[PDB]
Amino acid sequence: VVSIPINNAGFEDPFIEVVDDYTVDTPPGWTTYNPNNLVPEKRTTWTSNNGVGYVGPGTQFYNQLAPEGRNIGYIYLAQKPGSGVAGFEQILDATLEPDTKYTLKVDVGNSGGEFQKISLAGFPGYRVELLAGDTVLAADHNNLYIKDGEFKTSTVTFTATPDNPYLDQKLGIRLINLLQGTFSGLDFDNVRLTVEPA
Amino acid sequence: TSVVSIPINNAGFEDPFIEVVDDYTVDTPPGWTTYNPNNLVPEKRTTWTSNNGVGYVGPGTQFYNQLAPEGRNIGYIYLAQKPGSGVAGFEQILDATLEPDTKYTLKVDVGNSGGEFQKISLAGFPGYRVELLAGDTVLAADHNNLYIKDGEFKTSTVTFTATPDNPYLDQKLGIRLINLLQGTFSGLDFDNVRLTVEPA
Ligand SMILES: [Ca+2]
Ligand SMILES: [Ca+2]
Ligand SMILES: [Ca+2]
Ligand SMILES: [Ca+2]
Ligand SMILES: [Ca+2]
């Protein structure tokens, strides 16, 4: 298996010392996908936000450690369901090539438990996107059922043919909070993109 | 309490009957509506406008190395606009409603037609999305997850579990079968839509 490198693919940057502590700024190496302007430029704990969080022993949110390393990346949206979507985006240096099969995998987390006496029960729905340029080549729109406190792996594959219109455009990844339910937060971890001849 | 099929109108595009092999309609199949969020499909269609309809895929067909997945006919969507211009396809709202503690399984066969039509190559594929709705909300969707070679069909499967806390319970279920217009030749076929519900 041959990987395409991704920056901060496991959200391990930055290091977080205290269990369940978190940042509220875009993880290094990623940008905030914000097509509906739901996430402000300047965040608090309680605005719509995204960032990184440490899942270790003593976590109140999960029934297992982080899928990879210490940290997961989270997206929280405070607007009512139906208001739009937001998430993580990363554009890669690798470009779409013909007769090549791409396999994107990411672990999707449904945080459970309670935060400042607010229940995290429920899930907003997720979408995992593989891009060339601004085009979604293939995407998993919420196909996995993920219970509170658990993670499941989403897998998206795509084969580009010689006649594909998007050849030579940069590959990208989006990890999206759909805001289709409450509690309206979800987590991602361990992003992997691998490539093989068709 | 067990696996039940939810009824869908004209679910194999068998209405209308078509006598000549590879003959087709260019109007919205009975029981479905034209999903047209980017206004790509005109209200009146001819062969080479953007359109949708049904087509007979039987012995003699120039478009597939297999017969129609179900019965005689498939349903198709063709888009004349350039890649990137938008999407269009089929939509059907069902009488059934979203119920809690249930698992839904939507299956449809997706066809990448091959061959030639009026010296126009059918090689290539626009991409598809299959959507399960409640009300206006796409609960789960297969956005082009299967690779489908020219001249074959593959079955797309979408599942969704509805919890007691789902915001859209009691809203009408719906189905969308979408041409993504992300490639040429910019037509694709669908057949054999099935929706089941079972305790979760
Ligand atoms: Ca990690
Ligand atoms: Ca949750
Ligand atoms: Ca896992
Ligand atoms: Ca049929
Ligand atoms: Ca084709």
d(CA B177, CA B62): 23
Please answer yes or no on whether A136 and B142 come within 8 Å at the CB atom: no
How many structural domains does chain B have? 1
Beta-carbon contacts of A134 under 8 Å, excluding residues fewer than 6 positions away, are none
Residue type, A159: T
CB contact under 8 A, A137 and B123: no
Nearest to A157 among B137, B145, B166 (CB): B145
Distances (CA, A) of B55 to A57, B12, B90, B111, B183: 59, 11, 15, 12, 21
Q: For A29-62, b where at least 16 C-beta lie within 10 A, e where not — what string?
A: ebebbbeeebbeeebeeeebbbbbbbbeeebebb
From CA B140, how far away is CA A143, in angstroms rounded? 6
Give me the amino acid identity at A107. Answer: D
Q: Residue B41 C-alpha to ligand 5 middle, in angstroms?
A: 20
CA B20 from chain centre, in angstroms, equals: 22
> Nearest CB to A142: which of B123, B124, B139?
B139
| Contact B21/A at CB under 8 A | no
Instruction: Tell me which residue has tokens 């969080």.
Output: A53
Q: Does A14 touch chain B (CB under 8 A)?
A: no
Contact between B129 and B143 under an 8 Å Cβ cutoff? The reply is yes
Which of the 8 DSSP states describes residue B24?
B
Experimentally determined by: X-ray
Please report residues of B whose CB lies closer than 8 A to that of A101.
147
From the DSSP assignment, how many helices (H) and strands (E) are in chain B? Answer: 0, 13
CB-based contact A73:A29 (threshold 8 Å): no
Q: For chain B, how big is the Rg over CA atoms in Å?
A: 17
How many CA atoms lie less than 13 Å away from A131 in the CB half-sphere?
A: 19
Query: What token pair was written down for B126?
Result: 């626009």
Q: Which residues of B touch A85 (CB under 8 A)?
A: none
Give B180→chain A minimum CA distance, Å: 10
Which positions ≥6 away from B119 have C-beta within 8 Å? none
How is residue A190 written in tokens?
A: 């361990």
CB contact under 8 A, B124 and A163: yes
Location of structure tokens 């010296």: B119
Whether chain B has a CB inside 8 Å of the CB on A78: the answer is no
Residue B106 is encoded by which pair of tokens? 């939507």
Contact between B141 and A141 using a beta-carbon 8 Å cutoff: yes
Who's near B118: CB < 8 A, 6+ residues apart?
Answer: none
Q: What is the DSSP string of B137-182?
A: EEEEEEES-S---TTEEEEEEEEEEE-TT-TTTTSEEEEEEEE---
By the CB < 8 Å criterion, does A138 face chain B?
A: yes
Residues of chain A with a following break (C to N over 2.5 Å): none
Polymer length of chain B: 200
Which residues 6+ apart lie within 8 Å of B83 measured at CB? Answer: A165, B126, B181, B182, B183, B184, B186
Nearest-CA neighbor of A173 among A42, A48, A73, A46?
Answer: A73
* Resolution of this deposited model, Å: 1.7
Structural domain harbouring B90: 1-200
For A185, the token pair is 């937060």
Distance between Cα A151 and ligand 3 center (Å) = 5
The count of other CB atoms within 10 Å of the CB of residue A13 is 15
Six-digit token pair at A82?
Answer: 């139906």
Q: Who among B83, B125, B140 is closest to A141 (CB)?
A: B140
Closest-CA distance, B190 to chain A, in angstroms, reads: 18
In this structure, chain A runs to a length of: 198
Q: What angle do CA B3, B8, B12 make, to 5 degrees?
A: 105
Q: CA nearest B75: which of B199, B196, B188, B195?
A: B188
Contact A180, A125 (CB under 8 A): yes
